[PDB]
Amino acid sequence: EIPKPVAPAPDILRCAYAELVVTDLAKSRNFYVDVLGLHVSYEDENQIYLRSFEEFIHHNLVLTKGPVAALKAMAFRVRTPEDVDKAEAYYQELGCRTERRKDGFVKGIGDALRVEDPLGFPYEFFFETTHVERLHMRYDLYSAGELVRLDHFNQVTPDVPRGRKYLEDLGFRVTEDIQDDEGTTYAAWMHRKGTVHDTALTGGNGPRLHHVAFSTHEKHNIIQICDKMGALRISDRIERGPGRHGVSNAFYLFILDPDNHRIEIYTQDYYTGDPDNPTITWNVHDNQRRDWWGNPVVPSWYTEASKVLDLDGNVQEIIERTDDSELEVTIGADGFSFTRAGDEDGSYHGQASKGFKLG
Amino acid sequence: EIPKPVAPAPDILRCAYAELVVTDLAKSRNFYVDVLGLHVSYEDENQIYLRSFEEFIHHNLVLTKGPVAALKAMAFRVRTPEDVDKAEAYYQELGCRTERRKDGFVKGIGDALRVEDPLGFPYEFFFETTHVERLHMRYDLYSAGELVRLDHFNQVTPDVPRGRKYLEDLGFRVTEDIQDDEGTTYAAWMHRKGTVHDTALTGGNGPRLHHVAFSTHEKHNIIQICDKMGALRISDRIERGPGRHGVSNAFYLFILDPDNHRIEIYTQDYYTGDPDNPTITWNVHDNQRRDWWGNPVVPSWYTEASKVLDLDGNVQEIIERTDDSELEVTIGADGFSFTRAGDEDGSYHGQASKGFKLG
Amino acid sequence: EIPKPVAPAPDILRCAYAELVVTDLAKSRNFYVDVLGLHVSYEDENQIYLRSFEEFIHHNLVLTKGPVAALKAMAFRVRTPEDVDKAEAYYQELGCRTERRKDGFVKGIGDALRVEDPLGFPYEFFFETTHVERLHMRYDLYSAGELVRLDHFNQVTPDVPRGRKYLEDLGFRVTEDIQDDEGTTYAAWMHRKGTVHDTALTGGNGPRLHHVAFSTHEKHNIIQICDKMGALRISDRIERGPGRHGVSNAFYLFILDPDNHRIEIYTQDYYTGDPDNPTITWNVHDNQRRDWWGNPVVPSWYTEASKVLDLDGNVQEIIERTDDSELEVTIGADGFSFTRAGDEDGSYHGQASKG
Amino acid sequence: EIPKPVAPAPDILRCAYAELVVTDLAKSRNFYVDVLGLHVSYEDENQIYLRSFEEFIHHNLVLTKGPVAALKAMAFRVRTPEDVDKAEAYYQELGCRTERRKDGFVKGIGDALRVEDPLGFPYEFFFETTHVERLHMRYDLYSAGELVRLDHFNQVTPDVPRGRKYLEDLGFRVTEDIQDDEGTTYAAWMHRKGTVHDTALTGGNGPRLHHVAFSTHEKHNIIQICDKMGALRISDRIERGPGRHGVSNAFYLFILDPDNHRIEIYTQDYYTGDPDNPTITWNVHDNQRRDWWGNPVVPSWYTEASKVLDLDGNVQEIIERTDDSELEVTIGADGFSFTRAGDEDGSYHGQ
């Protein structure tokens, strides 16, 4: 349905940064700097520019004060200056609105293209960026919960196959997905950089941003973030986890920022860089697909996500999903999940695993 | 109202082993040896004797084939042979049924006393035991989920203060407890060996055995147990966790054996051996008391526990708790819990944390 | 000095496997399978095919029984079948000897090109491989010391700049190197897959294979390999480490197999896939460059390395390095190293660090 | 030959703190607070009082400014107030010089006895201490290298059997030791609290303090200390390790403070609380006894240790060991070690 352009796709390296609009800059700074330990590249009254421990580009996260909390841009770094021109030509052929600024939208980025993509998401493509001190061996700064890299984005969109085809044409390869036996796709993960993903599509009303993910070196680092949140008496901001994912095999945690933007902390997924990397499809009823240990997925994880902005800074209208809901088919009234395919024992009918039901 | 005897209490070193009755020895062997990796000290068609990686006494766990799965004995090692005689005189003065075997009740234990204690529990006291090869440096055998020590037992009993007084007279010192503002005690932890506990009392219908706990060296060892259970497609036997406890500060997991006996895997609590070790009392509505990260306690954790046997091998009758239920006051339809005392933000009314209600 | 071909370079994805000739297949099996826990994809009385925990291609390591212990092939996977034709045309234009087999040289590999490259190393390029069960979630098999991926090779070669230019034309990017203030290069690391390296050049007499490196998930996994080696009373096969590397920032261990083939266990380097990834150059006298904690590098690590074979299976003649020796300039009799640049305190004259 | 008093021994709970004299308080503070992340219980211009993450007593370490860097006191907590009276009567009977301060020698400690013990070491015994906030769940303060408990001391003394018997009389039990076939004891580890040790005796010239040890939760915490020292470009102050010990089975690291006091960071030894805990004896020539991975023990680890003070603050005179030297019999010119007993492959001679 989204046609393959004749113009060549830009060569995308990786997810690079997200610009999030936040309502109280000081409160958000306390979360991202004082709680999570991200490193300040620049700040003023209106914006905070943050980077992870191993990053050498100017930032992985820009926090921009505004009236309505939202994703303003998810940004991908491209291989060459010329790929920014390629991006503009490709999205113009797709019929999308685009904006080009030769000196960047945010500080520390040069020539950049922002687009309203066909799924309603504000993507940025850039090559030029101000390099900064790469802090990877600054163990004098290293925190017990240190965030070392930006890893991925996760986007909520109503029609996953439509989005998946478009991202494949753009050069992302699907590594894993969740489907059922009736033709429905609930989620797909897709990459450029050779990890399980750079972005992912989650079926639901959208466009909305599900989360931004940062990695740690080790599992104990994620444990420490939880432990610190308990010490700060903000354990109510731990949404889900910690856990082992089935999809991706990573150890993970989901937490919520002061504007309810969801952040994932993630570690130890696998290499996907080979072009015939085997695609893994999980059945939506498999209770080990999202949490390998079977722990239930809280309903807010399926229903809540961040607004996204258009190029004018207005909120994008939400389009309802008409395909089946993962929540409904797994933990809802008519839901079903299994631990062992075909075994009634360890199965759940109309409720979540481990003795819980939907609140 | 359990009187303090005139006879001197035995000097108790530590929890040493449990004897659990199991209905299918081979299935229980698969769980304890093949899944959990405990080391066999002796086995035949009737029993399997198991020890942890660091142990030098003959065993920490005896699995005994029988018709009805239950706790048959929870054993404490005493400091000298003469302390077994002290235990005998002590329980005789309490008016408890005792049985003394100069030869032992199980293999690898010598002179031993079993008693039906005033809370209905089968306690064993012994000094003499057959030493075995201490495996602590056998890294050729070490598994990714290695269980290194037996840490503690946890007992369900209807009246926590009655039991705690009796354990205090036996020499156990309370480290932590859970109470409400109108004077109900829900749980207490108490020790002899300088950790948070050797045994613990959980308010509920009793006598029942809540769990037996083993330690690991590190937190990743507990994560591996979960990961392994997912790979074996037995994630439905992971009851609760992993997590960080509030009480004890230990990293933990609860799993269920083939007869539903609950096993805890635990690591990294703190030193309590000083006699003025500061006690910690938690409020029952504090949602960080059990899981520090605020994750909900699954209802089965509060309701399900193993039968216990009397000295004839018959199941002890259960007495109902009349004080308030922890489940009901925290996650039940009339329950409540808080993240920050006094704050409605992050508080839960009539349901569990994180968005679940009771299934 | 090695010219850049007009023919396009093959698109190389990553290092994929090594073929090692070993002299006692049973002793080598005990080391790589029983001690290190690698997984057997295939075996017979002449060869063992092994793979790491997260691999889906047929193997990462082939142990081949033979009379002389040596590297027989270092193999890189290329992006398409057509890239094996590109590699062929490229090495022909370099004037290198090549051999192409549509059915592969070893089991589980299809159409493959082997070459004696300009530095005397036996390189293999392939696309086609037999997929196997990816064991990445088989935590029922997971060892406390589990090796999860093949990470890189390290090659000993007398002239590093000469080598570096050749690998860069082949599409490898230098991420880190070791130089001095007198124009000598002692080592360079270079990548395709976006980690610090897929191969590396260590200045010394060659061609010889320094080591093959496998990864673990976490640092405790490397600690366990050491602990296990102590329990098996084979701690004498631990050569160096464990440690933190300066170059790469990875946590590491060097151990020796039964034929003295050196294996590195490695974890937690950083992302290098951006094209302007900043290059890091260490000074050869910086005593934190190889072991970040300043632990001394044992002379065997500099002097010992594996023989390599040509396409006929004969040992390649060793060419002597005439540029300065990293050993001599840092820990030899007239050696020097520093902890802090310009500070006499914490410096070492004519001896290794730490006593 | 140290006679056992008739007076009963105090009941010692555990090693509790050390008082180290340091020459530059600000440099020392940098090391112990900014590098190692110990928590300040009290400070002024003459002393810094520090504690570990899980401690509730006032401190584990006192840094006192003075002209000569030395150990001033190694303090053990006793079970009751009356055990301080017992310690006084005990050491008086031993013929040792003692000093009782009913209000303590350092802040945060109450009634305390200091003694010049029969091996020349300044021991303190106290019960009363000011309790402080136990930081064990303050994960907002937790460092990647966090020191969680004080674990033990290690004393260098010339005659190990002589000091071992004295410590056994005091209620310490030996858990491990190092011996040769000829009957020489080179080291012994002994405990009260149910870990491998609260103190240890190293054969060498003494009295000198070999080290004070702190524990971490996990091995990665020790790795981080090393990584941090690399980043601060003070890797020259890493003396030995990190490693797995043979004796104790603990993961370890040894580092040097600005006055060359040696600090060990230590984790994951085993339980010794049972009275028939099996004692392990290693052969001095076994190359896995000290570092299990067979890494060499740098000679400075055997020859360097801190001076100790007497009760007047003067340096205690040193007595030179006449028994065989572990350095000499293993890495000296006529020394040797093995990986596997009886096997020349993996053995080391004069090296």
Ligand SMILES: O=[N+]([O-])c1ccc(O)c(O)c1
């Ligand atoms: O916080 N609780 O759930 C606890 C704390 C420690 C335990 O050993 C336990 O079984 C429960």
Ligand SMILES: O=[N+]([O-])c1ccc(O)c(O)c1
């Ligand atoms: O710093 N060096 O010693 C290095 C760095 C990375 C390596 O993989 C290696 O084999 C050596």
Ligand SMILES: O=[N+]([O-])c1ccc(O)c(O)c1
């Ligand atoms: O094996 N040794 O070298 C040891 C073992 C334990 C220790 O605490 C120590 O300081 C030295």
Ligand SMILES: [Ca+2]
């Ligand atoms: Ca269906």
Ligand SMILES: [Cl-]
């Ligand atoms: Cl998920």
Ligand SMILES: [Fe+2]
């Ligand atoms: Fe994600």
Ligand SMILES: [Fe+2]
């Ligand atoms: Fe427990």
Ligand SMILES: [Fe+2]
């Ligand atoms: Fe390497």
Ligand SMILES: [Fe+2]
């Ligand atoms: Fe020590």
